[model samples]
Target: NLLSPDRILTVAHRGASGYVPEHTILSYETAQKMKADFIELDLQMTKDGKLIVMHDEKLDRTTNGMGWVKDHTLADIKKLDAGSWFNEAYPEKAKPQYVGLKVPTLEEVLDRFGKHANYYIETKSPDTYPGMEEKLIASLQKHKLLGKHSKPGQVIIQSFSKESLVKVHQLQPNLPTVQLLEAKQMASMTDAALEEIKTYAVGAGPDYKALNQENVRMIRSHGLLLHPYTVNNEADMHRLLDWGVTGVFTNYPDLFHKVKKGY
Candidate 1:
């Protein structure tokens, strides 16, 4: 299986975001085209409590409309031009594509892609959404996507918020969760951290640089797997693999695929 291969798993970050506007279905469809192992998705809620696929809390950088995404209903957000800003060549692929693309509900995405591919769903800063943890787990269970005790590695959940992850672990002890960390620092997996992860999480997702000898040793010392993010260059990819890093997140799955093919 691709997930158990000795080589690292290559996740298409934001659906070939380097080529298309991030988080658009165009981006995700591009990932499907590339045969990436997993399509990374960032989740956010609209003012009406609709779960949408988006990377940021606001629309300024990626869309024509300007305001907090949480303040807009899915209908309001769908009106903004999400692609033309990338380049005029992509005008047809612009935000109008979002008109009917009302922020996809979490259930919609799970139903659409659940059996077809692996998901790397991140609950972006759940601190902002007080009851998001319960809501997400409920939706996953309701969709019957949660893995059983005999086979618990099917769905992988991730979050930057330790508290949110803790909630997930407590709710679904068998489902795997990943702790996402930024590039600037590394957190030791002390008793407290381990306790929080024990419920459902089995690994950590850190910035690629955090996999250096000291960091790797520290993470391994805790008996947890380490997967790094955004490694696109061949040199860095090979370097991390040699370091025994478990997997990687990349914007260009083609680059990783070529490397695996020994090109």
Candidate 2:
């Protein structure tokens, strides 16, 4: 059986994305209200090089904007509707009325919530945004969020790109980094793979299905932490914790809180 129950962290994926639009301040605030251990944020660069809280490669889905988020300046992107698409009840939640709600810069978010909340920052497209790793760390430093944690593993920096985590690790070795893996790739979790990431990352964030006995054993055997993403079901959450997951990213932190109470 796995140990280290106290080490398990519960991160709010996309800030309670189940009830609100993903990446909004409303979503993040809800996560905090739900007592999430960390508020996960996805980062993308605007044409002007300002980092914004967003998920998709393009703005067409989440926002009222026309094209790729990188294609427009922050000012232009900010004018589009970010909230109305969720529902008519939130019509006024639309982007333009949000005055200051335009795509928030990384520095802006750090200034607002960095001190109060632990962050799970993901560089969605490190390759597309050249020097993004450096820029992100620089912003964190400027905001005094870097190394402000009371413990060694307070804040987590994660990315699908191995290069992105490497860059951050080179700059600040104390900060924990998680290497995100897809579902299929995690089916055969191995010691070798864990060892490779052990050089630069403290943990792995695999798809929720990867938390079976074999995968969890592989991670625990190598002394690597395991955090799975986007799990919202109660039964699945129970199963993951039973299998000894180190952490989990969820869209419904309230549900997790209920689970925590039972345990």
Candidate 3:
């Protein structure tokens, strides 16, 4: 199984976000070229309810906009220059072409990469958007990415909310899901919490800093895959892999690919 504990998945967090502006088509394309196993998407909804790929609920972090994503229509969002901020933030990697890149919708991503590239999607703050999970599933089905139309494990949904994941499970029981935990959540993790997670999710994605060998063992003992998030440093990646994590969410998929090669 691709979701097997033995398989080390190189999930490109926000699509090689270390190199380019996140959730842009260029970023995902770059990740794919770098041999990343999955193009990770953080989902948000516009005022029009279009499922746009973005991390922050607010637009100020990554876009040339000034409000909550939910307050803006798709047309308003399309007007923002999503990539210039990357150039401003990381001048060393700046490119003239990176300017004026628009944020891509989930459908845009599905249409662009299709079944050729795997997707690791997060329903970020799903509670904020009622019926978001239904929209996501509908998009997958519309793209023929559900069931036998797509390969097993081709798409994996993850969320920080157990409520959202459980809703997704109820909607599509066969689809794989992961539970994402913040540092505090991981710090407070218990066998019972993991046991509850296993009832709905295939694995857990935790903050790498909160992980230790003992906690790693506890998670794996339950046959739950452990994948830590936003690990950009090589040493951390190596350490997590050593502790038996099945995957990592990283901004440097190329580096992770190299690190995984030696193991």
Candidate 3 lDDT, 1-263, residue by residue in tens:
67878889999999988888888999999999999999999999999999999999999988889999999999999999999999999999899999999999999999999889999999988999988999999999988889765688899999999999999999999899999999999999999999999999999999989999999999999999888998999998888888888889999989999999866
User: Which portions of model 1 show Cα errors greater than 4 Å?
Assistant: 1-7, 88-103, 147-151, 187-200, 261-263
Rank ordering of all candidates by lDDT, starting from the highest:
3, 2, 1
Instruction: Give a tens-digit lDDT track for model 2, residues 1-263.
Output: 11243566778998877777778787788889988888888999999988888988798877778788889998898787776666544554444433333456677777778578888999998999997888888887776766545445546799999999988888888777999999887887677888999899888899987567877877877777888987999998888888878778998988887776544
Q: Which residue pairs in candidate 1 have backbone atoms (N, alpha carbon, C) closer than 3 angstroms, thus clashing?
A: none
| Cα-based RMSD of candidate 2 | 3.5
Over 158-247, each residue of candidate 1 has an lDDT whose tens digit, in order, gives 988878877887787766788887766454445565445544567778888756876666665666667789888889888777667767
Residue 30, model 1: lDDT of: 78
Clashes of 2: 0
lDDT of 2 at 132: 85
Off by over 4 Å in 3: none
Q: How far is candidate 1 from the true structure (C-alpha RMSD, Å)?
A: 3.7
Clash totals for all models, in order? 0, 0, 0
Query: Could you say which candidate leads in TM-score?
Result: 3
Higher-scoring candidate on TM-score, 1 or 3: 3
TM-score of each: 0.84, 0.90, 0.98
